[PDB]
């Protein structure tokens, strides 16, 4: 897969397509509407692809 680290601004909104979402039960998780993937980590900051 790929090697390194990532997240390292967690003071940076989320780019297009991703939206955070608060839950009692589920709490906060990252749904990308584009990417179709959900994780709690923010992969905001300089990152192309």
Same mark, same amino acid.
């Given at each position: 897969?790929?090697?390194?680290?990532?997240?390292?601004?967690?003071?940076?909104?989320?780019?297009?397509?991703? *939206?955070?979402?608060?839950? =009692?039960?589920? +709490?906060?998780?990252?749904?990308?509407?584009?990417?179709?993937?959900?994780?709690? *980590?923010?992969?905001?900051? =300089?990152?192309? +692809?």
């Amino acid at each position: 897969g790929s090697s390194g680290s990532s997240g390292l601004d967690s003071e940076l909104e989320l780019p297009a397509g991703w *939206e955070k979402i608060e839950d =009692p039960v589920y +709490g906060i998780y990252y749904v990308d509407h584009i990417n179709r993937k959900t994780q709690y *980590e923010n992969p905001s900051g =300089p990152s192309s +692809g």
